[PDB]
Amino acid sequence: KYYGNGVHCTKSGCSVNWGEAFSAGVHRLANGGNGFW
Secondary structure, three states: OEOOOOOEEEOOEEEOOOHHHHHHHHHHHOOOEOEOO
């Protein structure tokens, strides 16, 4: 179960793939590049 924050609970345990979250953050962060909405 992804929590829209690189946080998934697999095999009955919540953890962070990080690289998955990092990809989430970059999408949000790298979106505000001067323009181009």
